[PDB]
Structure formats: C-alpha cells, structure tokens
Design a protein around this ligand. Structure first.
Ligand code: CL
Lengths: 135, 135
C-alpha cells in the first residue's frame, strides 16, 4: 500500500542504477586481464563472452530483483505513507528530475571547489606544525 | 532576491557545516603531533594556543563567507528563483528536515546491503577470469 509508494520512490530516483559503477568496474576488470595477456583483437569475442557471463553472475548476486525488496523495507520502516507520497510528488516534478540529475555534479562541484581553496592553507599549517615542534 | 532564495537554500541544507570534518581533522593531527613528542599535562596550553592559529588559517581559505558567495552563485546559476522557492518549500517542511537527516545513514545502509550481496559473486567471477586465461 505504502509499499507501492516505496516502489514508486525507488523507480523515480532510479535506485536500480545504483549498481551501474560496479558492473562497469567488473567489465574493466576483465578488459584488464585481457590486455594483461596476449591481446589479439581477432579474439575480442573471448573478452565479450566473459563480459557477458559476469553480467549474469552479477545479476545473480545483486541484480535489481535481488535488491529491490530489501530496499522497499528500508523506506517503509523509515517513512510513513503520506511521507512517501510527498517524496513521490516531489520527485515526479520537473524540479524533481532536474535535481535528481544535477545534485551529484553540483555537490562534486562544491567539494572539488572547497578542496581547491583548502590548498592555500596546507603549507601555512605545515609551518605552524613545525613551529610547535621547535618549542 | 533569487540570491536570497539560494541563501535560504544553503542555510536550510546546512551547507555551512560541510567543512566541520576539515576543522576537527587538522585539530586532530595536532593533538597527534603534540603527542608524536613528549605528552605532558601542563603543556596543554601550547597545543591550544597553536590550534587557534590553524583555525583562523582555514577561515582565510575555507571560511563560510569565503564559500557562500561563490556558492550562492552556483545555485542561482543552475536554478531559477521559482525552483529555489520550492526546494526551500521542501526542506522547510518537516519531511524536508527528516530526509535531510536520514539520507546519509539511509544511502549508507543500502550500499552496505548490496556490497554484502556482492561478496556472493567474487569467487564465481574469479573463476571466470581464470577460465579466460586458460584461453
Ligand atoms: Cl537517523
């Protein structure tokens, strides 16, 4: 009931994409062990075969069908139904989507920036750290 | 005025506190350097008199007033006034404040749940990679 609300939520925020980075890392991991050994391109089809079987393997451990149920429980346990309705109402919005798509880049744009400002303080700190040592 | 919307936004999302880890952290390596040498208990003052220095050192580089400006710009850059009205309408709500408090634990729990389920495929994948060498 609200569980069909928690579904909605997980669809809407594209929770199933959460594994994308790991699938892709296991693709690379194979490409690695291919480029590592003899690399005859005429044998790309062997890289492709082992890159397909890993997928099925991963779908097995952490496929979205394996994950979803556990995720729903987490949201129901934590949000009321009315509470989920509004998250859906928000995340259905045009603004819902813009946000859902920018926020990453846009907190990684502030992090990446606050990290870069920090840089003008690491030496003067090192100096204060050497100055304490003297006493 | 778009600007007082973004301002309001950052306040609501407590983006000012993003730096908390970076202050405590430096004040965490000093305690560590005040004890990388002989660690007395009447010389507590010298650690503290040198921690007031590395505080205003960061305030020069990563003080709030040193990000806020360059920060509000980004949000107004990437959102219209009306949209900030609505983020603000959201994060003002009691649901906004809750979310803004659970999401970390909550995103961290789902990763913890998936990675667990991941393990159940490290070997099955190991075997695959191996089987690709025997080729
Ligand atoms: Cl909590």
């Amino acid at each position: 009931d609200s569980a069909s609300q928690a579904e909605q939520f997980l669809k809407l925020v594209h929770a199933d994409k959460l594994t994308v980075p790991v699938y892709a890392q296991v693709q690379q991991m194979l490409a690695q062990r291919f480029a590592q050994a003899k690399a005859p391109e005429s044998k790309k089809a062997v890289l492709e075969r082992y890159q397909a079987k890993a997928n099925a393997e991963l779908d097995r451990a952490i496929g979205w069908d394996k994950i979803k149920p556990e995720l729903i429980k987490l949201y129901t346990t934590n949000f009321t139904e009315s509470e989920l309705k509004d998250l859906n109402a928000f995340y259905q919005s045009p603004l819902g989507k813009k946000v859902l798509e920018k926020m990453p880049r846009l907190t990684a744009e502030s992090a990446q920036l606050t990290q870069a400002k920090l840089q003008g303080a690491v030496e003067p700190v090192n100096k204060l750290m050497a100055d304490m040592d003297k006493e």
